[PDB]
Amino acid sequence: KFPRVKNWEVGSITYDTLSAQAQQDGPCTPRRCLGSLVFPRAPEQLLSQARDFINQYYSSIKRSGSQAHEQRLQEVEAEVAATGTYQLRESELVFGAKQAWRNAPRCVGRIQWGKLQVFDARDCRSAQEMFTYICNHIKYATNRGNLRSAITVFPQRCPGRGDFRIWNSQLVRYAGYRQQDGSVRGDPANVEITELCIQHGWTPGNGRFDVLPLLLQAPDEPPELFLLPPELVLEVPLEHPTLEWFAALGLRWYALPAVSNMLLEIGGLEFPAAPFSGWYMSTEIGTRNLCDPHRYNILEDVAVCMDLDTRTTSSLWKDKAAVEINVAVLHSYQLAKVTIVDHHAATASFMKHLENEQKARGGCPADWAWIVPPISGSLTPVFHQEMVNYFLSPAFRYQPDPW
Amino acid sequence: FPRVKNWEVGSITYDTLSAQAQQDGPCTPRRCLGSLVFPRAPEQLLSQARDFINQYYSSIKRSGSQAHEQRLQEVEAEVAATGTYQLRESELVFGAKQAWRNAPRCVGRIQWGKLQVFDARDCRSAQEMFTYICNHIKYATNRGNLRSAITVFPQRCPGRGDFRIWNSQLVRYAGYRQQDGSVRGDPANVEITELCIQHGWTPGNGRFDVLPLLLQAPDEPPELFLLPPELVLEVPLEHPTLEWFAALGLRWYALPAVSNMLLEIGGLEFPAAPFSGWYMSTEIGTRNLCDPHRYNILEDVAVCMDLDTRTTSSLWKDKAAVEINVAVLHSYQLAKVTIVDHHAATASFMKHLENEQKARGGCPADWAWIVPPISGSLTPVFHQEMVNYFLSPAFRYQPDPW
Numbered sequence: 001k002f003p004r005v006k007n008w009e010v011g012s013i014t015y016d017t018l019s020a021q022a023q024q025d026g027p028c029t030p031r032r033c034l035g036s037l038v039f040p041r042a043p044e045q046l047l048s049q050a051r052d053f054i055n056q057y058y059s060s061i062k063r064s065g066s067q068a069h070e071q072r073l074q075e076v077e078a079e080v081a082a083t084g085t086y087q088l089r090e091s092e093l094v095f096g097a098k099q100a101w102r103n104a105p106r107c108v109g110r111i112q113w114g115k116l117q118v119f120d121a122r123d124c125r126s127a128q129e130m131f132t133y134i135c136n137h138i139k140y141a142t143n144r145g146n147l148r149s150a151i152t153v154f155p156q157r158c159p160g161r162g163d164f165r166i167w168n169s170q171l172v173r174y175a176g177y178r179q180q181d182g183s184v185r186g187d188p189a190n191v192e193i194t195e196l197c198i199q200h201g202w203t204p205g206n207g208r209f210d211v212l213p214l215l216l217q218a219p220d221e222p223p224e225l226f227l228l229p230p231e232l233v234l235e236v237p238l239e240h241p242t243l244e245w246f247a248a249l250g251l252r253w254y255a256l257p258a259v260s261n262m263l264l265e266i267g268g269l270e271f272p273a274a275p276f277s278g279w280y281m282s283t284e285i286g287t288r289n290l291c292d293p294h295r296y297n298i299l300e301d302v303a304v305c306m307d308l309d310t311r312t313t314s315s316l317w318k319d320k321a322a323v324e325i326n327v328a329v330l331h332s333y334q335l336a337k338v339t340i341v342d343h344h345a346a347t348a349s350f351m352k353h354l355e356n357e358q359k360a361r362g363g364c365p366a367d368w369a370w371i372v373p374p375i376s377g378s379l380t381p382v383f384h385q386e387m388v389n390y391f392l393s394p395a396f397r398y399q400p401d402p403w
Numbered sequence: 404f405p406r407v408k409n410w411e412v413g414s415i416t417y418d419t420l421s422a423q424a425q426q427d428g429p430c431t432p433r434r435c436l437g438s439l440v441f442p443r444a445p446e447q448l449l450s451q452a453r454d455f456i457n458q459y460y461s462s463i464k465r466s467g468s469q470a471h472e473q474r475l476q477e478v479e480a481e482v483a484a485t486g487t488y489q490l491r492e493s494e495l496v497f498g499a500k501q502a503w504r505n506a507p508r509c510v511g512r513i514q515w516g517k518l519q520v521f522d523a524r525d526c527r528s529a530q531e532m533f534t535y536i537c538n539h540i541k542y543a544t545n546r547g548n549l550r551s552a553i554t555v556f557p558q559r560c561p562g563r564g565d566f567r568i569w570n571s572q573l574v575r576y577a578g579y580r581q582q583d584g585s586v587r588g589d590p591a592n593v594e595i596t597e598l599c600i601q602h603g604w605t606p607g608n609g610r611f612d613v614l615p616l617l618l619q620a621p622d623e624p625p626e627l628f629l630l631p632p633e634l635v636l637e638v639p640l641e642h643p644t645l646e647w648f649a650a651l652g653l654r655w656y657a658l659p660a661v662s663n664m665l666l667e668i669g670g671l672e673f674p675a676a677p678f679s680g681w682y683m684s685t686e687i688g689t690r691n692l693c694d695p696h697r698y699n700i701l702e703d704v705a706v707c708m709d710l711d712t713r714t715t716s717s718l719w720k721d722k723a724a725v726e727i728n729v730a731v732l733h734s735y736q737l738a739k740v741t742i743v744d745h746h747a748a749t750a751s752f753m754k755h756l757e758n759e760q761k762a763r764g765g766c767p768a769d770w771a772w773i774v775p776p777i778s779g780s781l782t783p784v785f786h787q788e789m790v791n792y793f794l795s796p797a798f799r800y801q802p803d804p805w
């Protein structure tokens with residue numbers, strides 16, 4: 001009843017007994033596996049999720065079955081009966097945010113899941129106040145390059161009132177300007193959000209690394225435009241330790257990855273606006289963001305500059321250029337003293353996380369296709385580690401775009 | 404019908420072939436086990452045999468014709484007369500091609516229509532097994548112009564043991580347990596190296612000692628056979644610009660010939676049916692030479708390249724891995740031995756996916772095995788969603804004979 005899980009480098013075997021607690025269904029069936037898909041898509045149903053969450057909280061502090069445990073279950077149950085919903089205690093909100101991170105199958109950085117600064121913005125009332133909370137988040141998390149993981153959670157969804165939403169997918173994003181000749185200047189992943197910014201009154205730039213404004217949605221209001229103070233947005237110019245012409249490409253990336261479009265679910269309550277941030281793994285910038293053909297797509301230009309033979313695939317010019325672009329990212333962030341982790345250290349720490357979690361909970365939900373880095377996969381230990389993917393709660397969840 | 408998206412181009416297909424999945428994979432709505440390596444009656448036979456004959460005749464457009472009805476009745480009588488039945492040679496050919504075409508973990512299936520089938524179903528002993536295998540290796544090697552081939556030995560049946568090739572491949576380098584715990588040679592082959600020794604093989608002591616074959620005819624024990632060295636084409640590994648790379652003494656063999664999988668066709672089972680194609684360069688230069696539990700040479704190369712190995716963030720592992728793959732591609736091309744690099748191979752699999760969408764509404768594919776083990780996202784398959792399911796005919800794993 002419990003999946004056997006093998007590490008093929010070491011030969012070691014565990015059994016994932018935690019998957020038996022998966023609280024929601026994924027996309028696979030015995031007939032076919034859809035694990036490679038990007039989008040795998042009241043009263044006492046809310047109550048059973050809430051009771052489970054409270055059970056998790058009281059287990060974490062080693063007070064299960066205590067008087068305080070029972071009283072809090074009764075308190076939640078009575079509030080759901082009266083009002084159709086309930087409120088988390090402050091301590092429960094902190095625990096639930098950390099649990100949602102811990103439960104995220106596609107996150108390789110979960111060794112850190114216990115170190116998370118939780119800003120409680122549940123009393124936020126307007127889009128202006130939203131912006132203040134977000135600026136305080138960026139300042140705290142950036143910390144002049146010594147990055148600190150943080151999450152700010154805005155008011156929960158409730159009936160009779162629209163959601164708080166941040167329309168941008170991240171707090172810091174470069175504009176992508178759609179070109180009439182099909183192409184794009186800037187980041188192509190951000191074409192749609194760029195057009196929404198202009199529609200709502202932003203005067204666009206014409207550079208490749210123009211920081212986007214924020215579109216902030218308060219309940220039952222159209223989004224409002226807010227410009228980030230340039231000194232809040234720490235950026236790193238990209239150079240290479242030995243390829244001095246690299247600096248002339250004029251490349252740059254931003255310090256702080258702050259994801260703002262996912263939904264945080266805790267004990268059946270839903271928080272549609274709860275941006276979270278940590279720090280980058282360098283392959284995100286060096287491999288995906290700069291070398292994906294549908295992103296900045298610089299691979300061929302760098303290889304030409306390296307005087308590689310780009311006319312035959314078998315010279316492995318693509319692999320050589322990509323490796324140096326990753327070197328440039330790592331070197332440039334270290335030179336600027338901005339926290340970054342390379343894919344070797346990050347995957348080694350995840351292996352330690354897996355072993356911690358096997359002891360602590362008897363398994364760990366993990367999405368192999370997302371945990372293995374996009375370069376050098378089998379050079380990292382996670383490649384050889386079998387993994388079990390499943391959905392626990394608290395959880396970070398995809399949600400529709402509010403437009 | 405699952406929706407399948409390519410995230411580089413934005414194109415959308417629907418896999419209608421998955422609905423015909425013959426067996427069950429390991430996944431459930433509760434949890435996905437797609438990353439696991441091993442996904443943990445006369446009526447039974449007849450049902451599978453009928454589906455396959457129907458597959459075959461539909462594929463030659465003799466659909467429901469008189470040749471179709473007659474073959475169905477022959478199978479029925481043969482199983483009642485004997486408990487099994489015999490494939491026609493054209494059905495055997497079609498069945499081996501389909502089993503390759505259906506293999507979810509094979510990135511080289513663009514070639515699925517081009518397969519030489521050697522019918523060894525009349526084989527009698529391990530000596531004859533050795534002859535078939537030597538002919539296969541000769542034909543497939545073809546002086547380095549590799550040609551895909553499979554040899555099919557007699558099916559299993561009740562009352563009689565099976566034919567088996569005990570070696571996982573026809574060409575394997577010995578793995579020698581050492582008195583200091585380590586392994587000299589290939590750690591993957593420590594078990595079969597000891598089995599060969601146990602059955603009376605004089606061991607070598609090199610890192611690339613080609614193993615003998617342990618071949619097993621029904622019910623008598625296995626016999627050791629030595630491969631004639633001139634039959635085993637090898638490629639000494641050199642680097643186009645790192646002159647010292649040659650002196651590391653690395654080599655690999657030309658012909659990847661997998662000999663421990665079971666071929667299933669129409670409910671019949673062939674426990675010995677060795678098949679061969681040619682290598683994708685990452686199999687050798689990344690997995691076989693750089694896996695920590697294989698030859699594990701990555702740090703050796705990095706030291707020779709004078710890389711800074713005391714910090715992960717110099718990406719010394721990545722640079723050395725790439726140059727080892729460069730040396731592999733260079734050495735095979737120089738030796739005029741067929742090889743395909745991971746860029747060309749994944750570009751061809753994308754075309755295969757497009758051809759299969761038209762041919763039969765989809766294609767079973769195992770994303771984790773299709774995406775190469777270096778430079779994953781530099782290849783088109785990384786951005787391609789895939790659906791994994793089990794069709795028949797098929798190649799399946801099977802327990803070791805011991």
Ligand code: HEM
Nearest residue numbers: 101104106107108109112149151276277278279280281396
């Ligand atoms: C502390 C350093 C961290 C590192 C190095 C890290 C690393 C990563 C990486 C490389 C990914 C895959 C992203 C992609 O390919 O698009 C990811 C995904 C994810 N991370 Fe982490 N992470 C960190 C912290 C955090 C924190 C603080 C949270 C939340 C509190 C978090 C939650 C998530 C979630 C929910 C995903 C899945 C996102 C998706 O499916 O799009 N991570 N992480």
Ligand code: HEM
Nearest residue numbers: 503506508509510511514551552678679680681682683798
């Ligand atoms: C002709 C050139 C071919 C290329 C370039 C190629 C490439 C590959 C690669 C790279 C793998 C992954 C193997 C691993 O990582 O261990 C694989 C798997 C596989 N191939 Fe192909 N292959 C070729 C021909 C063939 C042929 C002729 C057959 C059978 C008739 C075949 C059947 C299979 C099967 C069944 C697997 C799955 C193996 C497993 O699960 O262990 N392939 N192929």
Ligand SMILES: N=C(Nc1cccc(CCNCc2cccc(NC(=N)c3ccco3)c2)c1)c1ccco1
Nearest residue numbers: 038039189257258259276277278279280281284410
């Ligand atoms: N591709 C699309 N959307 C899309 C869908 C699913 C997934 C993605 C991938 C986008 N992950 C962004 C992301 C999520 C989590 C972590 C990090 N990174 C970190 N280090 C970090 C951040 C915070 C703490 O740590 C980056 C994108 C799309 C839709 C329409 C057109 O394109």
Ligand SMILES: N=C(Nc1cccc(CCNCc2cccc(NC(=N)c3ccco3)c2)c1)c1ccco1
Nearest residue numbers: 440511591659660661678679680681682683686800
């Ligand atoms: N060794 C083990 N693990 C393991 C288990 C299952 C599978 C594997 C992976 C081993 N595929 C070998 C293989 C299979 C198919 C294709 C190729 N390559 C080609 N190009 C080729 C050959 C013919 C035509 O083309 C290589 C490894 C094991 C089992 C028990 C203890 O350890």
Ligand SMILES: C[C@H](O)[C@H](O)[C@H]1CNc2nc(N)[nH]c(=O)c2N1
Nearest residue numbers: 036037038369370785786787788
């Ligand atoms: C189709 C495939 O699932 C898709 O390209 C995935 C694969 N693995 C990934 N892994 C990470 N970390 N990030 C991604 O965007 C993806 N993309």
Ligand SMILES: C[C@H](O)[C@H](O)[C@H]1CNc2nc(N)[nH]c(=O)c2N1
Nearest residue numbers: 383384385386438439440771772
């Ligand atoms: C655990 C994981 O399934 C295992 O390491 C897989 C991953 N992908 C692979 N992909 C290929 N082509 N060959 C392999 O042996 C593997 N091994």
Ligand SMILES: [Ca+2]
Nearest residue numbers: 079086087088
């Ligand atoms: Ca209250």
Ligand SMILES: [Cl-]
Nearest residue numbers: 257284285289
């Ligand atoms: Cl990003």
Ligand SMILES: [Cl-]
Nearest residue numbers: 659686687691
């Ligand atoms: Cl191999």
Ligand SMILES: [Gd]
Nearest residue numbers: 241242243244
């Ligand atoms: Gd230089």
Ligand SMILES: [Gd]
Nearest residue numbers: 647706707709
């Ligand atoms: Gd030297």
Ligand SMILES: [Gd]
Nearest residue numbers: 702712713714
């Ligand atoms: Gd060392």
Ligand SMILES: [Zn+2]
Nearest residue numbers: 028033430435
């Ligand atoms: Zn699955």
